[PDB]
């Protein structure tokens, strides 16, 4: 898939044997019987990141690995100096910014979110921004319906797909 590029941090460690790393290659059916069960976005050491990092303006963009000064790096985040500077994808105008990723041992992490109470790609308590790895980061949203939506953040028109319960 699009994730197997050398600018993706790939520090994965399925210590609990969930199967989540296999879900990144082959699309897998999640066990729905397990489903029911304001932070700022900065810089994440790549060593705690597995798979692609997405931020949302609310439009989704991928953040690749760099060194701590913003120079792109191509070693799968395996270098101790590799980072993900999330805030370099924040637009200069706008109060809408959040990101989401998987940490090393298979947990979905999040920061930022809508202005405000909703973090990362979640727009409302029932809707999140759709993006190519939503089902891997949020497998319990697999039956959410896709809606074309239009949002205005500080004047600019955003046209994106929202997945909604």
């Amino acid at each position, epitope marked *: 898939g699009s994730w197997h590029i*050398n600018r993706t941090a790939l520090n994965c*460690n*399925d210590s609990l044997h969930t199967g*989540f790393l296999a879900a990144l290659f082959y699309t*897998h*059916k999640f066990n729905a019987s397990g489903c029911p069960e304001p932070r700022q976005c900065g810089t994440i050491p790549a060593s705690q990141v597995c798979g692609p990092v997405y931020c949302f303006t609310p439009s989704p963009v991928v953040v690749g690995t760099t060194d701590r000064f913003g120079a792109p790096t191509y070693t799968w985040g395996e270098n101790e100096t590799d980072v993900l500077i999330l805030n370099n994808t924040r637009p200069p105008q706008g109060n809408w910014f959040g990101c989401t990723w998987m940490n090393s041992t298979g947990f979905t992490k999040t920061c930022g979110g809508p202005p405000c109470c909703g973090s990362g790609p979640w727009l409302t308590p029932r809707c999140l921004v759709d993006y190519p790895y939503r089902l891997w980061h949020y497998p319990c949203t697999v039956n959410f319906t896709i809606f074309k939506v239009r949002m205005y953040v500080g004047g600019v028109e955003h046209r994106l797909n929202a997945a909604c319960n």
Partner: antibody
Amino acid sequence: QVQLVQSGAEVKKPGSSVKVSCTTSGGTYINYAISWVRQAPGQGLEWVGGMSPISNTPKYAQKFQGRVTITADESTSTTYMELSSLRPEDTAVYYCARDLLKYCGGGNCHSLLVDPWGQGTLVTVSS
Amino acid sequence: DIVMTQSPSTLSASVGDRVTISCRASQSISSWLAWYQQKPGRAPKLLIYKASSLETGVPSRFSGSGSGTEFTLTISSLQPDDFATYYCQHYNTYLFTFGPGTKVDLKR
């Protein structure tokens, strides 16, 4: 509380075939790649084959080329090992275990046979 | 094909001893080596992967060392639960291959 449950013991004449199953329950995902390892009476462990967690296609020790076919029923979380042209030395306890992608290096990821294993299936091949 | 061998084939030691057992690969296998423990009549158990990484839940008295073609497993202080047969195993995308195993029994 994932569990792997194998089908029951089998008795076969030489030259026949046997099809053993492994069903997963209690999992985070409905299906897992499964591999098979056997142990003859008094002997060591011998990998036979299973489904790859990357390609979701069978992979075998090529010692078994042409008489092992591995298949999977996605709707029943079951994987099957069919071993043909059976010979007395195929008499063994056959275990299954998830072939699970565990860690990555340099963009390449590696899978291990991880806990829990199935309980074992005795297959006896004899006239 | 890559062939795994182990030494010694059997070892008698006491509770509390330091034990080191060895595994050799016919060709270079980098760090793609794992150790499994097996008690008679039961399924094996993964202890170590990537030559030296402990599997989740495995006591710290276990350790592994080596790279390339020479590997060891070490038990810093043998305990009653440790008497068992230990198999090394090379893994890659295409196959797994087990070594012949080393049986450690309790000396009395």
